[PDB]
Homo-oligomer: A and B are copies of this chain.
């Protein structure tokens, strides 16, 4: 079983810590990004998500509520057991910016990947 509980680093140098996974697959955590729109403002930020409970390589999603920006990032992906029996999260993300008017919604969503491994 691959599970999300524990400390992770992604390929950008960001680190996150994910707490215990409950009976419904729910979890909370913290995220410290290495990169940002304004790197001088980066603070620790909370995350909340759900993983599938029974699968050995479960898919999951989480939302990061950035404490230094009006932006939100969502991550979704799959917790894999790699060739060496080590856990790897392959994720894709959407980074949503706050726009002042619905008419500028088109500009507001960045997309990307991240690979996480244990710290």
Identify the A interface with B (CB < 8 A). Answer: 12, 24-26, 35, 37, 46-52, 55, 57-65, 70-78, 80, 82, 88, 90, 92-102, 104-113
Instruction: Give every chain B residue within 8 A of A60 (Cβ-Cβ).
Output: 63, 72
**Docked pose: A64 CA to B76 CA in angstroms:** 10
Q: A72-B61, A92-B109, A94-B94 are in contact. Are A48 and B46 (CB under 8 A)?
A: no
Instruction: Give every chain B residue within 8 A of A73 (Cβ-Cβ).
Output: 61, 76
Instruction: Give every chain B residue within 8 A of A106 (Cβ-Cβ).
Output: 12, 35, 112
Q: Tell me which of B49, B51, B57, B111 contacts A110 (CB under 8 A).
A: B111
By the criterion CB–CB under 8 Å, are A98 and B46 in contact?
A: no
By the criterion CB–CB under 8 Å, are A76 and B72 in contact?
A: yes
**Docked pose: A109 CA to B37 CA in angstroms:** 13
By the criterion CB–CB under 8 Å, are B109 and A82 in contact?
A: no
Instruction: Give every chain B residue within 8 A of A62 (Cβ-Cβ).
Output: 63, 74
